[model samples]
Target chain A: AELSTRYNLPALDLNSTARWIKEPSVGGWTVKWGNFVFHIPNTGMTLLHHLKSNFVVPEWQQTRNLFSHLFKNPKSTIIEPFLALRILLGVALKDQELQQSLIPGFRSIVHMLSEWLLLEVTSAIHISPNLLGIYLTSDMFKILMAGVKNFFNKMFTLHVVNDHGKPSSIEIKLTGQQIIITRVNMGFLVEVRRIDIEPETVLSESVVFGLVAEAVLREHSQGQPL
Target chain B: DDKMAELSTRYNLPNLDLNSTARWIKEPSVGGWTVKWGNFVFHIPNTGMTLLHHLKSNFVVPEWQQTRNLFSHLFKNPKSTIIEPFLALRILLGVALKDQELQQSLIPGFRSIVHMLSEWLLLEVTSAIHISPNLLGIYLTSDMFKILMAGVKNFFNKMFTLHVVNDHGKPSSIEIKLTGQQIIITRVNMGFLVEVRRISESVVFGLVAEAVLREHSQMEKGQPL
Candidate 1:
């Protein structure tokens, strides 16, 4: 209860989660992380059971209460899942402490949740409005991790040194035409020369960083104590 | 011959041939004629009445004179279109047909295909004469409507492109609107100097050209032919 007040989110009760898990097939079961509950099919019950067992989202539980104020009953329309997913990631990023331990897993969770919801909704004509805010499932989360890791490896391209005869820190720059080097430290005594690299790679990297930055900023602004 | 002459006289039909009449007027008068061209209804003095009547009765476009001006000047161009050509044949066909020069000039190859126009009422045949009322219904066709739309679009696009491309700095936007069925195209760019010096100048010239072309084409073709 205290955790819920601190984090400002709805507390998930495991007993309630398990009761739904034990229910027989009625289309499927869905979690209404927002206002409404969306059920996954009985076939997905096994997967949900597996996820429920493994999903130790105590952090979310602490802020469970705060969510009622912050998040609304989300729209079941196409834009809703995407918006929810982005917001969840943004929240994860804003919390530096939470990001340290959970970002890797959380991102994958968001992607998985989004993909599953979208898939299920695609098959059904009229999805319940309650099944709106879950942004990650299990599979998509892994895919996003792979993509994000690939992005970070490319951001730190160059480091350089200054004029005090000290060896410059590594820097990335235009290494004539398409070539790029590991180290770019040039002290001021060294004559400057222009180099070129495939700036396209850099540009692509910027877009991914931009996504992460936006998510982080979004979470920071959602300062409600759950 | 007397039966035909009696039929013509009873119906008040004018004599078809000047050579057959006792004497022809040196110049036709415009007096006593109330002719309406589109929305424009004007009475010509007796001197020009005959010419005006031909225009009023034979080549009337059904709208106000302003609308006629609007259609002719901007909306429905006829020179490059099929409307007036269709009208011309419809107007002149009753006058005479025996003269080789008139037939050849109107239909281009009337000798070979003259039967189709007069006998079969073929649009393709009569369309060559430049005035066949056969195409009054052509206005409903998608082809004709699309061409009119294309012309209007092209006209506006050209006007805007010309206004923007010559400017030294970036132009904000150009707006064109039609109000009261008359065109009120306004250009809102970022400069007053260009508006005053170049844009305003182009508008005056454009309007003048639009008017001259609009009137002359109708007058040249519909002028008592």
Candidate 2:
């Protein structure tokens, strides 16, 4: 009860970390985690089981649709997970106790937890296209990069700096021909340049077709026409 | 034939033409006429007796002469017994350019300049009150009805009947009630009744306010703000 209150997790029972309810079904068994209930198939395959009166989110589909539409290219989608990481890292950097605890490599444990939740949400919607060797080719890629740059700006404003020479915020400037993502690091501004992209960056192709398709599919599945 | 083609293209109507034989004046003194254009026939009965027709030609018509001026000026020419169709179109276009809501009806289709004029005419000379949860009441103003009955036969895809029955040169004060889900327009002692539904109460109020604003704006443009 103390742990639950501390973590703001009212639905979790700390005594039983992973409880399996065995019932007669076509699938092997059922696992209940908070509001999520899913069945494991006999083929040893992980299947998502939908139940009636489950997590009823009113406009989650619409919000996801808007996000998918805005976040273009695998490079942009990959930025979302990293953005969450940046936020947590900024919080850790600001907390004096958290920093002192990190002296014993305790921050790695907190970082791993942040990654787990990021991947969990991203994996459900197929946001992360591939693990490596990604190339983005779209005219809208510059605008998406600008959006990601602004997110970091808002994130750093809420957290502490390194205090030695860390700048207040990040700034991005997009020209007609090129985009520049720059930030001040330790008294001077440093530019993170050289993004990986296909040699032939054509205007005809979109780098985020898969992400857009998946979002449209999810919206249609919610009984709303896209 | 060229005039017919021009009319068809200009009005976005299929096979529009003027009927020569159908045109006639009802009487010499009291102005009345029958005009047949395309599938629609506009008949204006006894114009001189109405409040708008009786008003002598001045530099400016009153603001209250809402739809009255447009209807009266077109048919009741001071010196002409013959009503010119071309003159009426020019006057309508002029009126539409001045009014914001009426200008929207000028878009080519069954929804034309004439249709807008008819709708505006219906709105004018009547007061409307709309309350929440579905209650809309329209009361006709106390003006000399003068039995100036105006109507458009074959309006859009339906036939509309406009009946104005009252004493000569006297306003018939009566309430015209329009409920939800009704389509027919009926003439009452006070005003006309036509059903409106699926519209928000604020929007209903806004529509009236916009009409008033448009009129004021037009008057300001003519003189000063």
Candidate 3:
């Protein structure tokens, strides 16, 4: 007998109570999964497409507002979605196949999520609100994909401090959440998941390294043992 | 990308407060492990580490993510086949308090929370926060967290009604099958997260949307009507 048959689990009919909700960026089913209600927003494509499309979450405060619209209820306790998301994220990242499937620069997201989970779990007033709705904003995906694109555009000037006395500066490009930069020279170069930062704060990667190389070049020009 | 970027830290962990550690203890009881963390005393029918053992033994750990190195910290014998109740409690608290360094302060609420998790989910708490077998167990999915929150609520009022288990059977970890993948939660790694041969229908069904909601509605009778 198949496990589903023998296991004899009552199928969780999420759709039984699931209902459609509309809002810009994300819209779809608001369904109950345990304590929280999740907005499985309209994917407009196959589940594969949804997963393949770089996972997106909106600005921290803004996304909270949107999800609140979906989850906030009168009789239920309100919950901070990130708390569950943090646990869920830990669950998702644990899978090797899922890890392979996730976008390359996803670690940055993990970083913030870990930080957020800790922050929320610890710094709380434990009012015990449920009726929570968790969902990703359409815009959250934009910046993540943008960051992935930014990873490509961001240039790296490696200062290979090999001898501790002198190092060489070389420019290069590569990808992933955090990598060992080695064009001319590289190390400690990481792609940050900058979901919370403003557009102006997002300096060009080239500009960032230009400042780095220039600053180092000046220091080297003066502190030469040769 | 630009290749990668630097550096790290070589630091020593803090000394264990053997005094604080003294605050919690697990003793054998009639159908379960009797545990007391601080003033709160309760009993759990097996840590469900039996299921945890199976979840760990069966799966070939894919190295994409690694197991947590916490087993050494939790277990008295490095090579232990049996997971004592007190040890499992430590792992659950660690997962809850991963970044937060208030284990001593939070033991009060944690004790109550542990009671809720054991009774409600039939999941014996373990310490696998790492997502592998030991730390390498089931990924604690969002939904699992939702169900687990029964304890979180109980922390405030200590009033969540228990749907008392009849048979103190084998340790039953938890598992939730998502659209794409199946998530496992064994006690060896149940620090907030395991898998099994269908992972005890009780667990899969526990995580399926309705069971938790049903349990919430059924068991949460904290007052006299």
> Order the candidates by TM-score, highest first — what do you get?
3, 2, 1
Which sequence of candidate numbers ranks them by DockQ, best first?
3, 2, 1
Off by over 4 Å in 3: A1-226, B1-21, B59-85, B95-225
Q: Can you give the lDDT of residue B196 in candidate 3?
A: 18
List residue ranges in candidate 1 displaced over 4 A. Answer: A1-204, A208-226, B1-139, B164-184, B190-225
Q: Which candidate is the best by DockQ?
A: 3
Query: After TM-score superposition, what is the CA distance of residue A211 in candidate 1 from its true location, in Å?
Result: 18
Instruction: Tell me the tens digit of each residue's lDDT in model 3 across A1-226.
Output: 0011111112232221122122222122232322223332221113112222223222122222322222232222222222322223222223233333334444444344333332234432221113112222233343333333233222222222232322222222222222122211111111121122346486322211100111111111111100
Write the number of the candidate with greater lDDT, choosing between 2 and 3. 3
Interface RMSD of the candidates, in order: 45.0, 36.6, 24.6
Across A1-226, the per-residue lDDT of candidate 1 in tens digits comes to 0000111112232112111121222222233232123222222112112222323233222222222111121211112222222322222222223334444544444333433432233322222323322423333334344333332232222222122222222121211211111111100011112222354354211100001111111112211100
Q: Write the per-residue lDDT of candidate 3 for residues B38-114, one digit (tens) a residue.
A: 22233343323343343334332232012222222122223333344444334333233222222233444343433
Which model scores highest in lDDT? 3
Which stretch of 10 consecutive residues in model 1 chain B shows the poorest summed lDDT? B1-10
Model 2 stretches astray by more than 4 angstroms: A1-97, A102-105, A114-167, A170-226, B1-225
The true-versus-predicted C-alpha distance at residue A57 of model 2, in Å, is: 36
List the lowest-lDDT window of 10 residues for candidate 2 chain A: A1-10
